[PDB]
Subunit: 30 residues, 8 copies
């Protein structure tokens, strides 16, 4: 269904936020 | 449907936050 | 509809968060 | 309706987070 | 209604996040 | 109801994030 | 119910974010 | 159900954000 699909897209976007925050951690290390 | 479309716009906005955080990581790396 | 409109306003606010985080990245650069 | 009104209050609160993050960018620029 | 009330409590909590981020900005200033 | 109760638990968790961010501001002030 | 349970899991995850932010505050102190 | 499953994926993504923030704390500690 379209609502579950859209919530799955929000989950994917939050995972992209996590990946970006890992990039910040690496930049501080470095 | 309009609710699914609005949730997809929230996902796009969260991807924009992810990209902004990537930009911060690049700024720290410099 | 009013719920979809309100979700669209949440998306716009998350885009404002992204813009603010870009301003942080620029301040670090710088 | 009260649910749409409450979602609009969440959007306003997210704009407040955006403004706080702008304040952080200004503090770093100084 | 209880759902609208609970969403209003989430809005209040996001405003508390904004206030905490302002405190961070002040600490950097500083 | 159980959905309202779960949304109230999300609000409490967001207040915990706010308090953690206050802690970060205090750490920067030191 | 499964939706309330899933919202409770989102609350637990936001509490984990709060704990991680406390770890950041401690690292700055340090 | 598919909505509960999608909300569980959002919770997992928020745990990924928590772990990324832990990584940032470790980077600052070094």
């Amino acid at each position: 269904g379209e609502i579950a699909q859209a919530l799955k897209e929000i989950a994917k976007a939050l995972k992209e936020i996590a990946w970006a925050l890992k990039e910040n951690a690496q930049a501080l290390k470095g």
